[PDB]
């Protein structure tokens, strides 16, 4: 074994000690599980999404997913690159979770959106406190990486908001 | 005060003489100025469009909006060619457009597209009579500017009639 | 005249008997046929389609016809490499076809997008038929080559299929 | 029926009376037909064509084709925009056409071309008349467009036409 | 109507309260106005900018004003995310403005330009006090986004700046 | 619940009756699952690798999971195409998955490889007998699919293997 | 045995563990490869050969041709070589194994006309295009499904090739007495 | 005064009207800079030297790695240097300069082998990291948020690069004793 | 005037002294007035070439004569680098050049390409001198920049020389 | 035959008389072959390399024996310029080199590396000999391609010449 | 050590023994040591550059510090390539630089960029100097890569030649 799950020892390359570099591993590795359950739900919704406007919803949904992906990875390598280990397995990174994922039925397209926002909600709250905490412990690139990727999870949070509003061009006539 | 808003002295290097380009030069400030109003609305349903087909709408307004703002600058910078003053500050511009405009409320889609629609339907019959008006004073190229305009900014008239037409893959049974 | 329509000649080149080629173009003919008659009715839809997901839906006919079309470009080259003359005549790509083609009104998308449903099943039955046919004439490059078509032509019929599934984020409310 | 065959309902969006549309519609909708024969005949002299030469008219037949085939798009589109029914089974576009067409034999480059070339003049006359009938309307954006496809039109025509004047490389002494 | 313009809402998806969302709103919408007074008198000095240097200035100020239309673009989207209704017709956004916008004459480039820089200047000292209280409400992404705009409106402001400076090549020997 | 995990509806458009469609589905799934906990573990091996030869590594590794990431969209969208539904929560991928994952503490490389690269054996095997079922079930498009992968898959196992050989530049002298 | 130089033996075809194929499986695909392989490079050679002697009135467009053949055949031998070492075998290396491997014709050092030049070639394609037909069956045969499509892959981009020798070979030209 | 050559002086600070930054808050940024620019182009110059002669087992991935590194920092330079002179400064320009002003320790011209050479640019890098975070930290209290965000932007390239030579000298490899 | 035609200053800034800047800009003008007279050559066969071969022929031509007017371009503007005024008009660059030039009739592309053949020997036995005469003088640069140009007329000259070899596919049954 | 091997008859085309021509070609020939052999034995090492830095050496190997294949090119095509035939046949083309070949055996990295760098040595030292015979000869076409082909083969050649260098990031205890 | 500082141990692998590599390498060393201070003082006057035609020559500088930049990055490795040690440090490239550089204060930028020309000037006479002894040793590669950055060099020095010219657009009434 070269590192144990669970084990922040800092780095000297990037002059950050264990004791603030754990600070900042506890709460980046938390949203990596999130990130990462989202990710797959995300991904979920992208294959089974039907319906009237499917095809719009399948791309976004896609690009939802490539763009949680993308953070996941950052939020990974940053554990990793202050000394700690970052969760690696599905049954890890569910289980590390605290964002509630939908059992394996398949729901219509609102259900699955309105759940998708729910996480979104929960892993914006989190990273917003997370870049405080980051700054506060003076590990800018830590925060700014935060707020790099909160821009990004906001903008698609926003989407899903939008996708979710009561308006269409769809009249009782055309129906 | 390098030049007087209104006027206009023509070209030696196009060989345009004032008067003839005055004439063109009221027709193109005139479509200036609702091309740019036009522009501006179709920014504002485009951040405000929400709803089922929200992200289409808010990708086709996007781009509507861009090809109104190239419109504008092709427009602006032929009144500037011909020795004229094109119409710049906001204020000006929404002052001398002959199209109505929104007020600051938001409404839903469907009303949002029928007003472009209306605009872009006079900028269209403007356009039309512009593009005759040039060529008749053998200002071959701004005639010529004026249809390639004219093309895409039919298009984009053309996408909101279709938005706004009685069918859709929607049926009360998915409803 | 350089060859007759009907006739299969093989290709020493390839080293195809006229037998065994005669045999993968009858096969790739038909095939052909049908998917120029999908090709012009993708257009025909592409053209037409209105209604709150016309946009989206006219983009993906689009795409879907320039698929269908490559697909035939694929058919009508390998018969003619193969010593075959590829129906080419609109008139005769109809009257070769076996599936069914609107009359020239225009339905509603959900009618048209249905249409066109069937006329992928066909072809897709089809060409399953035909790759085990070239496979079985030890014809791999054919056998490849309508695989390679299946996918494409599958991953359309798929999308149809979902743009007709009965969801939808539009509700009552919204309604 | 969403929309007959033959009818012309003009566009409010494009401030189009259903008069003076249906005439450009007329005309549109004939080229169509043209240019659809004309597209699937460059596409058989492209898969068919074979000898010293073959390789270079492939590449320009696949590309007149595609040409072709775009400029039909445009004209029916336009017929679309326009509130009229493009043709589009291949059976009504072949009926609807008044170029020749060949028989479903294969004839040497030679007269495969010159065939073409025929296709083209026929065309090419038409779409002239046709932009003047447009400007003539006040229709500047389909004369535009017209003008827009005969020039690509014209330089396929042109190439064609020199591919068979009385010019060579070649010499008795390399034959 | 769908929102009145003036109203905060807030966002669910964001979890960002009505309370809170405001005061952000409150500060984009005004750099918002002063935003788009900028980006269209950039146009204007775009458009007319003559002399010497001209072609380079007509590129700078076409960049420079490009940029603040996509600043404005970020602002307004920001505030429709956060529950508001972003200014948008030009009359709103140049009342709403408290910037200084030169007359409908066009001034020498000089005049023009140091105009311009007094706009930035004030817009530079605005979003920086915005982020500030961005970052105090907890609002990172608001913060971070207009850092990243705040970063290319001083670059352009440095321009202006440098180009205004009391050096040149220009000798009194070459003149 | 729109679907329910397990059920296999097969596909109208795609002409797979539920009984064949099932037993691709069955295979589909299987593949998912390894597939999913590779791409996982892939990734943990990415971010982790440190040593000589670890930027490399890293680089192999993040490709080897964006192609794991690319297999599993493919099989997931074709086994819904099919009218099933795909395992999507992590903790489903991994109860599902068959092959072995590490345990949450990070290995050295070598061991970490090869670890990967029993997994890899694992899929290929398991992607040869499932490309064969396909086949023999008249699914060609799934059987080509899988081919499609396996090559893909087939190459990065295979530079497992050569990345663990016995062999190096370096030498007792260099060391 | 650990004191041979040589890290492996020509001939001889150890299998993959990754790639979970035993050598008893994978021999017979090495075989099959490695003789496309020496046929595929021979191509490959005669194929350049061609492209930088072509004359004549429609050289440039054959030059164009020939090389875009060389570099999809060079490609081929490239993906067939590979699979040979995927599969614990050592693919036929040196120019003068290559062509003593290979079965097809190649010419001698002289130039021929075009015509003759391309004959030639036809008649090395369709050797490989019927080699590579039975080398995908015995691939899908032997269960190895990735070897199979990259032959099918290949023998696709071929069988182009050879049918635009065919094509160039045809009996018709735009040319006329008339123009001569 | 209306007298002078010199259109700048090193050393002032004359803060921007355009960038609405008085001299006084402008020099404390500027006096942070120019501090990292100087350290930012020795590291630089250093990356390029094992760039250059970085040699051995994995030397190429070395040398484009130490090469990329390199760019970032002269990047990083560009944007400080070019962040001083908007604030009114006048940035180190000369070499002599730039190393007389770094804090960092420089390798003497003797070339070292790449575990020493990478372990003494580890250490320039922490010392610009370090550095680096106090200057975000003084700008955003000077409330200059773009010098901030600028910093923050370089701070997370510069640790990246920092983190891979980091790894590069860990105790891992793929070798063996055997293959060995 | 700021120049005169024929007098050569040398460069301070490339350390090239007057007199021997004037034995190569003495050489680069000769070069370029013949370069010139090719380009021109090469546009008029470009336009003028029909034929069975003269689609690639047309292209080729093309890209021979830009090739020409780059290899212009890069000796006016060195001879103006030297200090000296590059032949300009087209009378003077056609008076200066010691190639012969067709008269205004057009020829059988043999005929064409044979003439154009000529004017490339001349050139290349020229520039091989007046690199040799540049290498002598110590100016590297200049002797660098003509083997550059060198090379790309050799290949376009050596084009030609294939083109009108006694070679083609052309048999005496296909004619 | 068209042309026999051996036989050099120059070029009107180039002005390179067969005398002077046949020098040029005896050293392309020579250095045709043994750059091609060259090729052959970097595919080898590219196709077998294994161990712990395998990919590296993987991709640079692939790199070299694309050089070398271009070199190739540039070198037999030169030699067909000059009137020359250049070796073809794979047996020529050994059996005219003059570098070592390594035997069908594959042998360990260090070994294979080591005999390139001997082959590159062979044709660098070969290489500068025929640029001065090229120069001298006045053919400064050929010269500078030799040169441009020189400086890619040095670099890979430099770059064999590193990677046996007695210096490694491993250490006894990584090991 | 690894190598020591002014030694040149010449190269196998390039066929460069040490005798001659070292006059090499003493004449790319130089010529590196004072390219570098080139390039910093460009970086200078790019980075300090201010009045009416900055912008154009922040462009012009920074383009010409990156051509300085990658011509030292050729010298360095060379220098390398052929044994020897380039210099590094900023203050051993200072300390072996001939050129003349500013002192640390801003100048305007006539005197700035008179500065610069001369430092071209240096490098422009030492280059050409360089190649004949590279040439003269049998070294063409140094030789043609000495030639390559001569003539961008020679580029750039010409073009600040331009801009001191004693020309301008600006006349005493624009003043
Ligand atoms: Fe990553
Ligand atoms: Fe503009
Ligand atoms: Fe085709
Ligand atoms: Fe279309
Ligand atoms: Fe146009
Ligand atoms: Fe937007
Ligand atoms: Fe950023
Ligand atoms: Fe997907
Ligand atoms: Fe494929
Ligand atoms: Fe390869
Ligand atoms: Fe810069
Ligand atoms: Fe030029
Ligand atoms: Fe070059
Ligand atoms: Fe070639
Ligand atoms: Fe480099
Ligand atoms: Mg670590
Ligand atoms: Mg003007
Ligand atoms: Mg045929
Ligand atoms: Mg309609
Ligand atoms: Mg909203
Ligand atoms: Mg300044
Ligand atoms: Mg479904
Ligand atoms: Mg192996
Ligand atoms: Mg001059
Ligand atoms: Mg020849
Ligand atoms: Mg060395
Ligand atoms: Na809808
Ligand atoms: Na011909
Ligand atoms: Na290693």
């Given at each position: 074994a070269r590192a144990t799950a669970?084990?922040?020892?800092?780095?000297?390359a990037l002059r950050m000690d264990?004791?603030?570099?754990?600070?900042?591993?506890?709460?980046?590795?938390?949203?990596?599980?999130?990130?990462?359950?989202?990710?797959?739900?995300?991904?979920?919704?992208?294959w089974n999404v039907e319906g009237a406007e499917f095809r719009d919803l399948?791309?976004?949904?896609?690009?939802?997913?490539?763009?949680?992906?993308?953070?996941?990875?950052?939020?990974?390598?940053?554990?990793?690159?202050?000394?700690?280990?970052?969760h690696a397995?599905?049954?890890?990174?569910?289980?590390?979770?605290?964002?509630?994922?939908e059992?394996?039925?398949?729901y219509d397209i609102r259900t699955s959106l309105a759940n998708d926002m729910a996480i979104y909600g929960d892993?914006?709250?989190?990273?917003r406190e997370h870049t405080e905490l980051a700054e506060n412990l003076g590990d800018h690139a830590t925060a700014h990486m935060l707020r790099e990727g909160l821009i990004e999870l906001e903008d698609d949070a926003h989407?899903?908001?939008?996708?979710?509003?009561?308006?269409?061009?769809?009249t009782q006539g055309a129906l």
């Open positions: 669970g084990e922040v020892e800092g780095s000297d264990a004791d603030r570099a754990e600070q900042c591993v506890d709460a980046l590795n938390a949203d990596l599980a999130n990130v990462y359950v989202l990710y797959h739900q995300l991904k979920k919704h992208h399948h791309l976004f949904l896609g690009e939802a997913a490539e763009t949680a992906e993308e953070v996941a990875d950052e939020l990974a390598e940053r554990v990793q690159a202050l000394g700690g280990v970052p397995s599905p049954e890890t990174l569910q289980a590390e979770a605290s964002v509630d994922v059992d394996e039925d398949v892993i914006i709250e989190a990273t989407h899903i908001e939008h996708y979710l509003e009561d308006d269409t061009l769809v």
